[PDB]
Amino acid sequence: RSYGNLKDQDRIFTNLYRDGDPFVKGALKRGDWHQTKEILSNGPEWIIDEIKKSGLRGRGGAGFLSGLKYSFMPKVNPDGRPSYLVINSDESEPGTCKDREILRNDPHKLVEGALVVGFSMRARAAYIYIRGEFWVEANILQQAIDEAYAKGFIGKNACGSGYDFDVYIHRGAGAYICGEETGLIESIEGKAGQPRVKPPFPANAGLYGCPTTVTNVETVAVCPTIMRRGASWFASFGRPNNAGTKLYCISGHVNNPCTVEEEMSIPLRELLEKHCGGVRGGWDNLLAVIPGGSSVPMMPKNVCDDVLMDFDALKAVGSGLGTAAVIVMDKSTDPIDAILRLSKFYKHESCGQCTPCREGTGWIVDVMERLLVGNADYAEIDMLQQVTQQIEMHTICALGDAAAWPVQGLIKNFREEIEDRIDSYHAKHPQLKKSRKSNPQI
């Protein structure tokens, strides 16, 4: 079938455009906190099975199966230590602006999902890690949590089911690396926030040495609606192994940048000229698209003309869905400049703990700065490819891979453009002697 053209009834986030009050009154008017007592009455194993059968996958940029991952949590703690559920509300991936909309429009959905998931994994408390740049969103979520306490939905007799659940907000400062799960836990535990060496995994030893799980806002927020609607309803949308709806944020050189919600595995072009008003100057004016966050490698128009928007489809063409962030570029865009700015972003956000990332981010930026102006060699492109392959897959965490991928995509798609720039520079700038000293500082 032709995926897309979702009905308004099947939207989960009906408050995304601020058509009602986001607080407890509007949340009850929209159906939040409805029949939650009946949900908590069933055993946690039933909730785990329902999430597994729903086919929901992580929306944080990985795509792991949420139900199985939640099932990884231990069933009992002989030590008496508690279990913690952590909501990854940190969002610093360039191009992605969806969880901000969720928090500032539908906070009670997040709270209800947190309660349901924590009950499913038998967790005592829930810590929501919001970035410091989301000041307004943090205030709104805190007010919603206060209302939830005042209405007796969480804490002490949470929904009158005998379970104790506290929801807390931990506001973190500016750091992209704090989005990584172990780095997030280290940031909560009064530390810098550097990622840990795994194994061990947070399912065994996480926050404070207790079992912990880290999950995105979107999955938690859609869990209660999935539970009420049913697993089959969620699985009825999208391709197999790509079930459910998805929030797409589109920005850049498109006519109508916006955030929408649509059935997963939707065609890319059909999405753009259905919701975002088409590419500026027409489809022929398109140069490249980044299907996910800045971590995902960029795509050329050749595959953008036909590719669908999901995990497997974007992975089969040398990309990934990531966080469903769509960046569109016109023919007036300089790909080298955009990728250089992305590399400069990744250079500033490295935590500096482990060697390959800490040196390779700076080396990549320094090489790309010369590649932009043409003051380079034809072999420097291959050297950069080799340097990226050395950085990736050798580091403590997955940020090194995220820094390596965009440069590899840029090389693979516009080696000819890079060569043309270098050729023009060397044709306009004759030079015979080669300096034995280092390159001038930029």
Ligand X SMILES: Cc1cc2nc3c(=O)[nH]c(=O)nc-3n(C[C@H](O)[C@H](O)[C@H](O)COP(=O)(O)O)c2cc1C
Q: Which residues are annotated as a binding site for [4Fe-4S] cluster?
A: 351, 354, 357, 397
Q: Which residue in 89, 295, 343, 395 binds ligand SF4 (CB under 6 A)? A: 395
Instruction: Pick the closer one to ligand SF4 by CB: 25 or 198.
Output: 198
Q: Which string of x and - marks every residue 185-224 that binds ligand SF4 (by CB under 6 A)?
A: ----------x-----------------------------
CA distance 359 to 401: 14
Which residue, chain included where needed, has tokens 């490819």? 385
Q: Which of residues 166-185 bind ligand SF4 (CB under 6 A)?
A: 177
CA distance 9 to 229: 12
- Among 308, 326, 244, CA closest to 6: 244
Residue 170 binds another protein, judged by CB under 8 A: yes
Q: Which residue in 56, 342, 402, 404 binds another protein (CB under 8 A)? A: 342
Q: Which residue in 25, 68, 77, 132 binds another protein (CB under 8 A)? A: 132
Instruction: Pick the closer one to ligand SF4 by CB: 154 or 402.
Output: 402
Q: Which of residues 167-186 bind ligand X (CB under 6 A)?
A: 177, 179-181
Instruction: Pick the closer one to another protein by CB: 215 or 225.
Output: 225
Name the binder of 380 from ligand SF4, ligand X, another protein, none, CB < 5-8 A by kind. another protein
Tokens standing for residue 1: 């079938």
Residue 314 binds ligand SF4, judged by CB under 6 A: no
Q: How far is the CB of 396 from another protein (least distance, A)?
A: 6
Name the binder of 2 from ligand X, another protein, ligand SF4, none, CB < 5-8 A by kind. none
Which residue, chain included where needed, has tokens 């065994």? 204
Q: Which of residues 197-226 bind ligand X (CB under 6 A)?
A: 214-216, 219
Q: Which residues of 300-328 are buried (b: 16+ CB within 10 A; e: fewer)?
A: bbebbeebbbbbebbeebbbbbbbbbbbb
Kindly state the number of chain residues that form the binding site for ligand SF4, as judged by CB under 6 A.
Answer: 14
Q: Which residue in 11, 229, 301, 358 binds ligand SF4 (CB under 6 A)? A: 358
Residues ≥6 apart with Cβ < 8 Å to 62: none
Question: Quick one: how far is CA 58 from the chain centroid?
Answer: 9
Question: Quick one: how far is CA 49 from the chain centroid?
Answer: 25
Residue 61 binds ligand SF4, judged by CB under 6 A: no
Cα 323 to Cα 38, 59, 64, 296: the distances in Å are 32, 6, 13, 9
Tokens standing for residue 73: 């949590």
Q: Which residue in 44, 55, 61, 291 binds ligand X (CB under 6 A)? A: 61
Residue 67 binds another protein, judged by CB under 8 A: no
Q: Which residue in 32, 50, 90, 112 binds ligand X (CB under 6 A)? A: 90
Q: Would strands 286-290 and 266-267 be described as parallel, antiparallel, or unpaired? A: unpaired
Residue 400 binds ligand SF4, judged by CB under 6 A: yes
Q: Which string of x and - marks every residue 67-106 that binds ligand SF4 (by CB under 6 A)?
A: ----------------------------------------
Q: Lay out the sheet containing 84-89: strands in order across.
A: 166-172, 125-131, 84-89, 212-216
Cα 188 to Cα 103, 128, 193, 236: the distances in Å are 20, 10, 8, 38
Residue 208 binds another protein, judged by CB under 8 A: yes
Residue 171 binds another protein, judged by CB under 8 A: yes
Q: Which residue in 219, 361, 375, 388 binds another protein (CB under 8 A)? A: 361
For the chain, the C-alpha Rg in angstroms (whole number) is 23
Q: How far is the CB of 358 from ligand X (least distance, A)?
A: 14
Which residue, chain included where needed, has tokens 């697993």? 231
Number of H helices, E strands in the chain: 17, 11
Name the binder of 318 from another protein, ligand X, ligand SF4, none, CB < 5-8 A by kind. none
CA distance 131 to 294: 18
- Among 158, 66, 143, 152, CA closest to 108: 143
Q: How open is the CA angle 258-218-352, to the nearest 5 degrees?
A: 90
DSSP 8-state secondary structure symbol assigned to residue 357: H
Q: How far is the CB of 9 from another protein (least distance, A)?
A: 6
Question: Which residues of this chain interact with ligand X, rule CB under 6 A?
Answer: 58-62, 64, 66, 88, 90-93, 177, 179-181, 214-216, 219, 397-399, 402
Question: Which residues of this chain interact with ligand SF4, rule CB under 6 A?
Answer: 177, 195, 350-354, 357-358, 395-397, 399-400
